[PDB]
Protein backbone atom coordinates (compact mmCIF):
# COMPACT_ATOMS: atom_id res chain seq x y z
CA UNK A 1 0.00 0.00 0.00
CA UNK A 2 2.68 2.55 -1.15
CA UNK A 3 -0.12 5.13 -1.97
CA UNK A 4 -1.00 5.33 1.87
CA UNK A 5 2.53 6.16 3.39
CA UNK A 6 2.40 9.02 6.02
CA UNK A 7 3.42 12.54 4.83
CA UNK A 8 7.13 12.89 5.90
CA UNK A 9 9.82 15.55 5.74
CA UNK A 10 12.80 13.89 3.88
CA UNK A 11 15.20 15.57 6.44
CA UNK A 12 13.23 13.90 9.32
CA UNK A 13 13.38 10.48 7.63
CA UNK A 14 17.17 10.92 7.00
CA UNK A 15 17.74 11.94 10.68
CA UNK A 16 15.58 8.93 11.86
CA UNK A 17 17.82 6.54 9.78
CA UNK A 18 20.83 7.82 11.78
CA UNK A 19 19.00 7.45 15.15
CA UNK A 20 17.66 3.91 14.26
CA UNK A 21 15.83 3.62 17.65
CA UNK A 22 12.47 4.62 19.21
CA UNK A 23 11.54 4.25 22.92
CA UNK A 24 7.78 4.52 23.63
CA UNK A 25 6.10 4.69 27.03
CA UNK A 26 2.47 3.81 26.46
CA UNK A 27 -0.73 2.96 28.40
CA UNK A 28 -1.99 0.96 25.35
CA UNK A 29 -1.70 -2.85 25.85
CA UNK A 30 1.14 -4.12 23.61
CA UNK A 31 -1.11 -6.86 22.14
CA UNK A 32 -3.55 -4.08 20.95
CA UNK A 33 -0.61 -1.86 19.73
CA UNK A 34 1.24 -4.77 18.09
CA UNK A 35 -0.26 -4.38 14.55
CA UNK A 36 0.68 -0.63 14.49
CA UNK A 37 4.22 -1.41 15.65
CA UNK A 38 4.55 -4.22 12.97
CA UNK A 39 3.18 -1.87 10.23
CA UNK A 40 5.40 1.08 11.32
CA UNK A 41 8.51 -1.16 11.06
CA UNK A 42 7.42 -2.20 7.48
CA UNK A 43 7.29 1.49 6.55
CA UNK A 44 10.63 2.26 8.39
CA UNK A 45 12.55 -1.03 8.71
CA UNK A 46 15.74 0.79 9.94
CA UNK A 47 14.07 1.65 13.38
CA UNK A 48 14.31 -0.64 16.47
CA UNK A 49 11.32 -0.06 18.83
CA UNK A 50 11.25 -0.49 22.58
CA UNK A 51 7.58 -0.48 23.58
CA UNK A 52 7.10 -0.04 27.33
CA UNK A 53 3.49 -0.86 28.25
CA UNK A 54 2.89 0.91 31.65
CA UNK A 55 -0.03 2.09 33.81
CA UNK A 56 -0.87 5.79 33.27
CA UNK A 57 0.37 6.86 36.76
CA UNK A 58 3.58 4.77 36.22
CA UNK A 59 4.31 6.58 32.88
CA UNK A 60 3.96 10.01 34.63
CA UNK A 61 6.02 9.06 37.73
CA UNK A 62 8.79 7.35 35.70
CA UNK A 63 9.15 10.05 33.06
CA UNK A 64 9.18 12.87 35.70
CA UNK A 65 11.68 10.90 37.83
CA UNK A 66 14.03 10.04 34.94
CA UNK A 67 13.90 13.56 33.58
CA UNK A 68 14.70 15.10 37.06
CA UNK A 69 17.64 12.60 37.32
CA UNK A 70 18.95 13.75 33.87
CA UNK A 71 18.53 10.11 32.66
CA UNK A 72 17.72 8.81 29.12
CA UNK A 73 13.90 8.46 29.09
CA UNK A 74 11.27 7.85 26.40
CA UNK A 75 11.18 9.50 22.94
CA UNK A 76 7.35 9.39 22.76
CA UNK A 77 4.66 9.24 25.49
CA UNK A 78 1.21 7.86 24.54
CA UNK A 79 -1.38 7.76 27.37
CA UNK A 80 -5.13 7.75 28.13
CA UNK A 81 -4.43 9.92 31.27
CA UNK A 82 -5.38 13.13 29.51
CA UNK A 83 -4.76 15.46 32.48
CA UNK A 84 -1.26 14.00 33.19
CA UNK A 85 -0.27 14.21 29.52
CA UNK A 86 -1.57 17.82 29.20
CA UNK A 87 0.21 18.67 32.49
CA UNK A 88 3.59 17.37 31.22
CA UNK A 89 3.15 19.00 27.76
CA UNK A 90 2.33 22.39 29.41
CA UNK A 91 5.26 22.26 31.89
CA UNK A 92 8.24 21.99 29.49
CA UNK A 93 8.43 18.25 28.81
CA UNK A 94 7.18 18.28 25.18
CA UNK A 95 9.04 18.85 21.88
CA UNK A 96 7.10 21.33 19.75
CA UNK A 97 6.38 19.63 16.41
CA UNK A 98 3.75 20.58 13.81
CA UNK A 99 2.57 17.16 12.47
CA UNK A 100 1.98 17.16 8.70
CA UNK A 101 -0.72 14.44 9.33
CA UNK A 102 -2.65 16.72 11.78
CA UNK A 103 -3.45 19.69 9.47
CA UNK A 104 -7.25 19.01 9.90
CA UNK A 105 -7.18 18.16 13.62
CA UNK A 106 -9.65 20.42 15.42
CA UNK A 107 -8.03 22.90 17.78
CA UNK A 108 -9.56 20.94 20.75
CA UNK A 109 -7.71 17.77 19.59
CA UNK A 110 -4.14 19.28 19.82
CA UNK A 111 -2.26 21.34 22.39
CA UNK A 112 -0.99 23.63 19.59
CA UNK A 113 2.26 21.93 18.46
CA UNK A 114 2.90 20.26 21.87
CA UNK A 115 0.58 17.20 21.99
CA UNK A 116 -2.02 15.42 19.86
CA UNK A 117 -5.20 13.35 20.23
CA UNK A 118 -4.92 9.87 18.67
CA UNK A 119 -8.40 8.57 19.57
CA UNK A 120 -12.03 9.65 20.13
CA UNK A 121 -13.43 7.03 22.50
CA UNK A 122 -16.97 7.26 23.80
CA UNK A 123 -18.24 6.36 27.22
CA UNK A 124 -21.05 3.84 26.52
CA UNK A 125 -23.50 1.55 28.32
CA UNK A 126 -22.72 -2.17 28.18
CA UNK A 127 -25.18 -4.86 29.20
CA UNK A 128 -25.72 -8.63 29.27
CA UNK A 129 -28.35 -9.46 26.56
CA UNK A 130 -29.41 -12.65 28.47
CA UNK A 131 -30.83 -10.32 31.20
CA UNK A 132 -31.62 -6.95 29.45
CA UNK A 133 -32.79 -6.90 25.81
CA UNK A 134 -31.61 -4.02 23.62
CA UNK A 135 -35.12 -2.46 23.43
CA UNK A 136 -35.20 -1.97 27.29
CA UNK A 137 -31.71 -0.44 27.67
CA UNK A 138 -32.32 3.28 27.88
CA UNK A 139 -30.03 5.60 25.86
CA UNK A 140 -30.46 8.63 28.11
CA UNK A 141 -29.34 9.45 31.65
CA UNK A 142 -32.98 10.16 32.70
CA UNK A 143 -34.00 6.75 31.24
CA UNK A 144 -31.20 4.96 33.02
CA UNK A 145 -32.11 6.72 36.33
CA UNK A 146 -35.69 5.27 35.85
CA UNK A 147 -34.48 1.70 35.05
CA UNK A 148 -32.32 1.78 38.21
CA UNK A 149 -35.48 2.36 40.38
CA UNK A 150 -36.50 -1.28 39.61
CA UNK A 151 -35.83 -3.86 42.33
CA UNK A 152 -34.63 -6.32 39.62
CA UNK A 153 -31.70 -3.84 39.06
CA UNK A 154 -30.59 -3.64 42.75
CA UNK A 155 -26.95 -4.86 42.87
CA UNK A 156 -26.98 -5.37 39.07
CA UNK A 157 -25.16 -2.16 38.04
CA UNK A 158 -21.43 -1.33 37.65
CA UNK A 159 -19.66 1.97 37.11
CA UNK A 160 -16.30 3.57 37.78
CA UNK A 161 -14.90 4.37 41.18
CA UNK A 162 -13.68 7.96 40.50
CA UNK A 163 -11.75 7.79 43.83
CA UNK A 164 -9.70 4.75 42.67
CA UNK A 165 -9.52 5.38 38.87
CA UNK A 166 -8.00 8.48 37.17
CA UNK A 167 -9.80 7.73 33.88
CA UNK A 168 -12.98 6.95 35.85
CA UNK A 169 -12.69 10.41 37.51
CA UNK A 170 -12.15 12.17 34.13
CA UNK A 171 -15.14 10.52 32.47
CA UNK A 172 -17.65 10.89 35.37
CA UNK A 173 -16.50 14.46 36.11
CA UNK A 174 -17.01 15.33 32.33
CA UNK A 175 -20.55 13.90 32.68
CA UNK A 176 -21.29 15.86 35.88
CA UNK A 177 -19.85 19.15 34.39
CA UNK A 178 -21.90 18.80 31.15
CA UNK A 179 -25.28 17.02 31.94
CA UNK A 180 -27.68 18.01 34.71
CA UNK A 181 -29.39 14.56 34.33
CA UNK A 182 -26.09 13.04 35.60
CA UNK A 183 -27.11 14.10 39.13
CA UNK A 184 -30.39 12.08 38.94
CA UNK A 185 -28.40 9.15 37.51
CA UNK A 186 -25.79 9.33 40.33
CA UNK A 187 -28.61 9.21 42.90
CA UNK A 188 -30.02 6.15 41.06
CA UNK A 189 -26.63 4.41 41.33
CA UNK A 190 -27.15 4.86 45.13
CA UNK A 191 -30.71 3.44 44.87
CA UNK A 192 -29.52 0.47 42.77
CA UNK A 193 -26.47 -0.10 45.14
CA UNK A 194 -24.06 0.30 42.12
CA UNK A 195 -20.75 -1.53 42.49
CA UNK A 196 -17.76 0.76 41.72
CA UNK A 197 -14.67 -0.57 39.87
CA UNK A 198 -11.11 0.73 39.46
CA UNK A 199 -10.91 -1.12 36.08
CA UNK A 200 -13.04 -2.07 33.10
CA UNK A 201 -11.79 -5.65 33.30
CA UNK A 202 -13.09 -6.12 36.87
CA UNK A 203 -16.46 -4.45 35.95
CA UNK A 204 -16.95 -6.49 32.72
CA UNK A 205 -16.25 -9.84 34.45
CA UNK A 206 -19.41 -9.35 36.57
CA UNK A 207 -21.53 -8.18 33.56
CA UNK A 208 -20.39 -11.25 31.49
CA UNK A 209 -21.21 -13.63 34.46
CA UNK A 210 -24.65 -11.99 34.90
CA UNK A 211 -23.74 -10.90 38.50
CA UNK A 212 -24.35 -7.37 37.01
CA UNK A 213 -26.67 -6.75 34.02
CA UNK A 214 -25.41 -3.26 33.06
CA UNK A 215 -22.32 -1.07 33.35
CA UNK A 216 -22.17 2.69 32.81
CA UNK A 217 -19.25 4.89 31.66
CA UNK A 218 -16.76 2.31 30.32
CA UNK A 219 -15.28 2.96 26.90
CA UNK A 220 -16.52 1.73 23.61
CA UNK A 221 -13.04 0.55 22.47
CA UNK A 222 -12.81 -2.07 25.28
CA UNK A 223 -16.50 -2.94 24.88
CA UNK A 224 -16.03 -3.72 21.13
CA UNK A 225 -12.89 -5.74 21.93
CA UNK A 226 -14.73 -7.86 24.54
CA UNK A 227 -17.84 -8.20 22.21
CA UNK A 228 -15.63 -9.73 19.45
CA UNK A 229 -15.61 -12.96 21.60
CA UNK A 230 -18.61 -12.47 24.05
CA UNK A 231 -21.78 -12.50 21.93
CA UNK A 232 -24.00 -11.83 25.09
CA UNK A 233 -22.43 -8.32 25.51
CA UNK A 234 -24.52 -5.44 24.19
CA UNK A 235 -23.43 -1.82 23.70
CA UNK A 236 -25.78 1.17 23.83
CA UNK A 237 -24.73 4.70 22.93
CA UNK A 238 -26.22 7.66 24.79
CA UNK A 239 -28.38 9.86 22.57
CA UNK A 240 -28.80 12.71 25.15
CA UNK A 241 -25.07 13.40 24.86
CA UNK A 242 -21.92 11.24 24.85
CA UNK A 243 -18.59 12.14 26.46
CA UNK A 244 -15.39 10.90 24.74
CA UNK A 245 -11.77 10.64 25.90
CA UNK A 246 -8.73 11.15 23.66
CA UNK A 247 -5.46 9.21 24.13
CA UNK A 248 -2.71 11.90 24.02
CA UNK A 249 0.69 11.51 22.34
CA UNK A 250 3.66 13.90 22.64
CA UNK A 251 7.38 13.78 21.87
CA UNK A 252 9.84 14.13 24.79
CA UNK A 253 11.64 17.54 24.52
CA UNK A 254 14.80 15.67 25.60
CA UNK A 255 14.23 12.60 23.27
CA UNK A 256 17.47 10.92 22.22
CA UNK A 257 15.64 9.97 18.96
CA UNK A 258 13.28 12.91 18.25
CA UNK A 259 13.08 12.26 14.45
CA UNK A 260 12.08 8.61 14.97
CA UNK A 261 9.41 9.93 17.44
CA UNK A 262 8.17 12.42 14.77
CA UNK A 263 7.76 9.53 12.25
CA UNK A 264 5.86 7.43 14.83
CA UNK A 265 3.59 10.38 15.82
CA UNK A 266 2.84 11.10 12.13
CA UNK A 267 2.10 7.38 11.59
CA UNK A 268 -0.32 7.24 14.57
CA UNK A 269 -2.23 10.32 13.21
CA UNK A 270 -2.16 9.24 9.55
CA UNK A 271 -5.14 7.55 7.86
CA UNK A 272 -3.00 4.38 7.51
CA UNK A 273 -2.34 4.16 11.30
CA UNK A 274 -5.82 5.32 12.37
CA UNK A 275 -7.47 2.79 9.94
CA UNK A 276 -5.30 -0.01 11.30
CA UNK A 277 -5.98 1.01 14.90
CA UNK A 278 -9.77 1.00 14.34
CA UNK A 279 -9.75 -2.22 12.29
CA UNK A 280 -7.29 -4.42 14.30
CA UNK A 281 -7.35 -2.95 17.82
CA UNK A 282 -11.04 -1.76 17.82
CA UNK A 283 -9.79 1.53 19.35
CA UNK A 284 -12.14 4.37 18.26
CA UNK A 285 -10.11 6.52 15.81
CA UNK A 286 -9.72 10.30 16.01
CA UNK A 287 -9.48 10.80 12.19
CA UNK A 288 -12.89 11.55 10.67
CA UNK A 289 -12.21 9.76 7.36
CA UNK A 290 -11.78 6.26 8.92
CA UNK A 291 -14.39 3.67 7.80
CA UNK A 292 -15.63 1.03 10.24
CA UNK A 293 -17.39 0.49 13.55
CA UNK A 294 -14.72 2.06 15.90
CA UNK A 295 -14.76 5.45 14.13
CA UNK A 296 -16.15 8.99 14.50
CA UNK A 297 -18.61 8.50 11.61
CA UNK A 298 -20.09 5.36 13.24
CA UNK A 299 -20.14 7.08 16.70
CA UNK A 300 -21.97 10.13 15.25
CA UNK A 301 -24.55 7.86 13.52
CA UNK A 302 -25.10 5.91 16.84
CA UNK A 303 -25.68 9.01 19.02
CA UNK A 304 -27.78 10.93 16.43
CA UNK A 305 -25.19 13.48 15.30
CA UNK A 306 -21.76 14.89 15.82
CA UNK A 307 -23.29 17.69 17.93
CA UNK A 308 -24.21 15.02 20.60
CA UNK A 309 -20.47 14.07 21.18
CA UNK A 310 -18.50 16.13 23.73
CA UNK A 311 -14.78 15.37 23.28
CA UNK A 312 -12.80 16.02 26.46
CA UNK A 313 -10.31 18.47 24.91
CA UNK A 314 -6.54 18.13 24.57
CA UNK A 315 -6.34 21.50 26.38
CA UNK A 316 -4.96 22.98 29.63
CA UNK A 317 -8.64 23.73 30.46
CA UNK A 318 -8.94 20.08 31.66
CA UNK A 319 -6.35 20.75 34.39
CA UNK A 320 -9.28 22.12 36.49
CA UNK A 321 -9.79 18.37 37.18
CA UNK A 322 -6.57 18.51 39.23
CA UNK A 323 -7.69 21.56 41.27
CA UNK A 324 -8.46 20.36 44.83
CA UNK A 325 -11.62 22.58 45.31
CA UNK A 326 -13.10 21.35 41.99
CA UNK A 327 -12.28 17.73 42.90
CA UNK A 328 -13.79 18.15 46.41
CA UNK A 329 -17.12 19.59 45.00
CA UNK A 330 -17.58 16.69 42.52
CA UNK A 331 -16.44 13.93 44.90
CA UNK A 332 -18.58 15.15 47.82
CA UNK A 333 -21.64 15.20 45.42
CA UNK A 334 -20.68 11.73 44.11
CA UNK A 335 -20.10 10.07 47.45
CA UNK A 336 -23.40 11.35 48.87
CA UNK A 337 -25.38 10.30 45.76
CA UNK A 338 -23.91 6.75 45.33
CA UNK A 339 -23.69 5.59 49.01
CL1 LIG B 1 12.28 -3.74 16.56
NA1 LIG C 1 6.38 11.76 8.97
UniProtKB/TrEMBL annotation:
Record's keyword annotation contains Signal: yes
Keyword rRNA-binding applies: no
Binding site for Mg(2+) 1: 27, 29
GO molecular function annotations of the record: metal ion binding
A GO cellular component entry from the record: outer membrane-bounded periplasmic space
Keywords: Metal-binding, Plasmid, Signal
InterPro entries named among the record's database cross-references: SBP
Positions contributing to Mg(2+) 2 binding: 29
Residues that bind Mn(2+): 29
Pfam family, one: SBP_bac_1
Domain of life of the organism encoding this protein: Bacteria
Name assigned to this protein: Iron ABC transporter, periplasmic iron-binding protein
Species name: Thermus thermophilus (strain ATCC 27634 / DSM 579 / HB8)
Amino acid sequence: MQQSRPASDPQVVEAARKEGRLIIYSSTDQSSAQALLDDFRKLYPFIQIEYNDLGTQAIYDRFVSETAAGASSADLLWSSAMELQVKLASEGYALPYDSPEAKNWPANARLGNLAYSTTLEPAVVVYNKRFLKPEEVPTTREGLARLLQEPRMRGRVATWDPERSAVGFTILKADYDRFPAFQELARAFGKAQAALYSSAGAAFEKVISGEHYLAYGFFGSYALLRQRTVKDLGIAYLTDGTVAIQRVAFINKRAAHPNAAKLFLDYLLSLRGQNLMAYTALIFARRETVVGEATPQALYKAVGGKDKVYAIPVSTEILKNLDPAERMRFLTFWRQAVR
